[model samples]
Target: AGLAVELKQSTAQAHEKAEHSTFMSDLLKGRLGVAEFTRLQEQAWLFYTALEQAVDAVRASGFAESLLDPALNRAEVLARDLDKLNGSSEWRSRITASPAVIDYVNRLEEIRDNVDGPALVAHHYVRYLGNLSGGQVIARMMQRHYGVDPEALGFYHFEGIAKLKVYKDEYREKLNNLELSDEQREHLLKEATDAFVFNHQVFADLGK
Candidate 1:
């Protein structure tokens, strides 16, 4: 089987573990209130900032150029969503990153400093694809439960990506085409798993 399928299975296991975390479970089932959701996006702002910056370094190196897409860049979009969600222009100043958020950012920064394409791609696969799939439901939840406007949900809306599943296929195709050995694929799988666990830990930090 290809690395795409292999990593998907590994990340799926990681996703399963994350789903039971109190913060995610509460947010998904409408058990959580608006403040919790907004805080989640605030932390997301920190996480995506680091992830996108790391990808920028990897892309500049041209090691993972085929897998990096500028259209999918999301930090600015996240900031726009946060500004609207907070109902204030000065939202970032009011919010703070949890310890888990700092750890995740530091990991990404490490990859950026080293220009580690394999680690970057593993993180990229986990974050972007997870959002593309789960974000649709979350956007609706924000409206249906909290009655937030579509304008505040820009982070969930992939502008140029019409058919999400189709786009995912192309992304995985890029993954399969990467020149990798068995050990590298295994390393990617482990790295991807850790990335998901890092995400789960963030939710745990947010749970209280």
Candidate 2:
């Protein structure tokens, strides 16, 4: 009854501006080097790790359902990709967070402090739904253009989700069912929008 619609309305456009287009074009055309692509993955590790940790906080207090599926977590997904990308068995020792990811991670810490599920869910929507949905395309492109190791494209693989459209509508339905205050609804909307900003900035930071 609320925010999933608002989140789509507001944030989808925010993702289409300069940084997003530049990154997508570069990605699709292989205009960026593999090093640049790997840098984007570095930021994703920080980003999804923070978001999932905040989600861990949400589950501890115990209303998390439907959207909090552990299967959707990207930490291991990105970890696998990073290893393949680096051509190393241990890639964690070699990478660093970009500035925007550092900022995004701290913001997630703020959301985690109160264990705010609504806010956390907003970030969840921005990342999981947007990333996974779009990542289907990205995974294919990475395989096609970059010839990335097929095993490394796990981030976009969405295993067991053959009916992906049904999957997302179910996700959006769950968002509307969450109990929230008016202020919280508005806050979720803003957080969702800002999540897009965080995302675009990470791409911008990587592109630089």
Candidate 3:
């Protein structure tokens, strides 16, 4: 199978595993109150900060460079959401990183420091593309049930991506042409699967 097809098929189970996270289940049901949802946003802040930094760290090559897009950046947006939700920038100092969040960030750091080109693309694909897909649904849900305004939910509102589906197709086209060897493609698939593992841990750790 092709890399794009294989990446999607291999990660489907892991993606479902993450979706079944208790926190997310409650979230979709509108059972998650503001406090828990805010916590999730804060966790997002922690993870995306590390992920974006890793993107910057590894963007010196065509492979990693191809993945860089200001539109997909989320750390700053998450920070803004946290501040707006918390009613102040005090969330910056007050938010504590959960163990899972810390571990997730460490993995991104490791990927940047030691991984090959395709692995970087794998991590990038897992987070940003996932955001564009399932994350948009969650964004609307938060607005509908949780009273989160679009302005405060900067993480989900992509100013650069005026049309999500078009951008997503273009993104997949980029992935399809990344031109990895068989071994590198295998590594990429593993990294993509593990990305969901880290995400599941973060969601599981919330509201505990």
lDDT by residue (1-208, candidate 2, tens digit) is 3667877777757866733467767877878666767777878887888888898888777755668888788887788888888888566876678888888999999888889888888889888888656777777778787778778777788766678888888888888788888898888888887887787777777767
Better structure of 1 and 3 per lDDT: 1
Candidate 1 local lDDT, 143-203, one digit each (tens) = 8987778887888888887899898888889988998777777777778988987898899
lDDT of 1 at 9: 79
Rank the models by lDDT, top first. Answer: 1, 3, 2
Q: Provide TM-scores for the models.
A: 0.95, 0.92, 0.94
**Which pairs clash in model 2?**
none
Candidate 3, superposed: residue stretches over 4 Å from native: none
- Candidate 3 residues 69-166, lDDT tens each? 86788887788788888999998888888999889888888866764566678788888888887787888888898888788878887777788998
Model 3, CA-based lDDT: 0.81
- Each candidate: RMSD: 1.2, 1.8, 1.4
List the global CA lDDT of all models.
0.86, 0.79, 0.81
Q: Which ten residues in a row have the lowest lDDT in candidate 2?
A: 12-21
Instruction: For model 3, name the residue pairs that clash.
Output: none
Query: What TM value does model 1 have?
Result: 0.95
